[PDB]
Amino acid sequence: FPQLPPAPDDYPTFPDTSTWPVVFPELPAAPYGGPCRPPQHTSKAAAPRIPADRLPNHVAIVMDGNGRWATQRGLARTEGHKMGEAVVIDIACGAIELGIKWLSLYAFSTENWKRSPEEVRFLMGFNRDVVRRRRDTLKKLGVRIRWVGSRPRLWRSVINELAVAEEMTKSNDVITINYCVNYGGRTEITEATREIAREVAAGRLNPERITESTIARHLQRPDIPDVDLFLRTSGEQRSSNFMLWQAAYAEYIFQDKLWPDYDRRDLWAACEEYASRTRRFGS
Amino acid sequence: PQLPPAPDDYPTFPDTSTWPVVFPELPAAPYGGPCRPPQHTSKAAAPRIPADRLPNHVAIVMDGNGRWATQRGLARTEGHKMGEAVVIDIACGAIELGIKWLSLYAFSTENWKRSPEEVRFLMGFNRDVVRRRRDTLKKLGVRIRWVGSRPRLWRSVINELAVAEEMTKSNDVITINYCVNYGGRTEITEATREIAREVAAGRLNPERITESTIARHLQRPDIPDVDLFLRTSGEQRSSNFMLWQAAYAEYIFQDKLWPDYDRRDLWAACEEYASRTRRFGSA
Ligand SMILES: C=C(C)CCOP(=O)(O)OP(=O)(O)O
Ligand SMILES: [Cl-]
DSSP, rough: OOOOOOTTTTEEEETTSSSOOOOOOOOOOTOSOOOOOOOEEETTOOOOOOOOOGSSSSEEEOOHHHHHHHTTOOOOOHHHHHHHHHHHHHHHHHHHHHHEEEEEEEEEETTTGGGGGHHHHHHHHHHHHHHHHHHHHHHHHEEEEEEESSTTSOOOOHHHHHHHHHHHHHHHHEEEEEEEEOHHHHHHHHHHHHHHHHHHHSSSOOOGGGGGHHHHSSSSSSSSSSEEEEETTTTTTOOOOTTTTTTTTOOOEEEOOEEEEEEEEHHHHHHHHHSSSSOOOOO | OOOOOTTTOOOOOOOTSSOOOOOOOOOOOOSSSSOOOOTTTTOOOHHHHHHOOOOOOOEEEEEOHHHHHHHOOHHHHEEEEEEHHHHHHHHHHHHHHOOOOOOOEEEEEGGGGHHHHHHHHHHHHHHHHHHHHHHHHHHHEEEEEEOOOOTTTTTTHHHHHHHHHHTTTTOOEEEEEEEEEHHHHHEEEEEHHHOOOOOHTOOGGGOOHHHHHHHSSSTTTTTEEEESESTTOOBBOOOTTTTTTTTTTTEEEEEEEEOOOOOOHHHHHHHHHHOOOTTTTTT
């Protein structure tokens, strides 16, 4: 009954946004290893008690509003993105405290190449750096993290940092984070169709035996479960090609606040709302 | 691009004092062809929304029929009976507003999980509705056709729609995708299968499959992207509807139950759409 209890009062907190990048606190040693308890929120709030059967198994988040948050303050959009890093880690910590098993984060879409070259170059380098900067912490929290996305145009440096993070965390099981970079739902489905086509060309698949499960089995990360709860910040109400196959049956909750203002309490509030609702027939 | 407001003398719809709802006889157009649709009972006129802010394609999940009836001490089938006039009313309103494409979720692949008594009713009802209404739909310049999956669907339903399709194939006021036994994943799977057969026959190189290849092999490849995705009853799910096509759609979730719905609600949803900013990855 799956939440971590309220942390010890003196347990380290996160995030302190008075420095950039944010300092992830040193955590107390654990007597016999295993994953470390994540730092509690600055507010010292505790995760709501929700039965495991009523939790969303898989939460997907479109982390929207970074640039707007910056423009609103008369700053360059890339400054908003910088604040979003601490929020990603805060949300990871809060997902663990709540007992969420799967988290997918929309870091960069196949359509975001439409943004300015300066912004694209920044996001590519930033995602590379964030992964290197945070994967040791993620590992110690028992996070299993890996890349989900498409190869063309994506900086090899980003793929490489996530590949190391993936190898480092492949045996972890507290939570899995799908770090989606150069991700597009239609493209991922297209890539599965291509893999299916190759299998058929090789004679290893009869076209007449292709089902929905065949597609699922040939997606890039076939272990990703259906999305239960699809969250988006900034007041936008669209899925924007995120987890397209996997979120076919997801419930959507749209939260108005901008990603840099978001925190784990906001994740919990959406999960509570999801959990509280009478589950309708056929769901 | 709206029709100008109808004269106060022009016939109205729906008149719910009998069942099924009788569609009124209309006067003749100026040389031309399609009849001007009957105005709403309230005689309300469509809002003036410019072409560049209007949705080209609206998708509607018609939800809440059964709960409407339950609420009133009525068998669920009575709610479906009341929703039938609402479909026509929304068709009339779509034409008034200038919507070019309308997709309606008449029956999902998940709906096989309902009671056999309800499934048998819904099959026979859709059969009869298409038969009863296609002549009117033709006169209004509606191009209507079936979108969906063949296995399990009653042959009579497919046939009535095939007849409606042939009768209205040269109409161009509005296109209605009447989606029966439809599932987004299933539709994509069916495309993948078509592609797999071509690969098996030596006619397609797997390495040449692109997103466009999938689009070209969907059942109805002419259906454009969904701009506005609407669902009634307050439920915030796409439920596998127009899955490929709605990847970048705007979502509007309205609380109204479908038998209570009318064209003014469609227009209100379109006004909300008209001042949302779409980015498609940009900015
Ligand atoms: C996590 C975010 C917000 C980046 C995804 O951009 P999108 O392409 O998915 O979003 P829109 O352009 O439709 O606003
Ligand atoms: Cl329940």
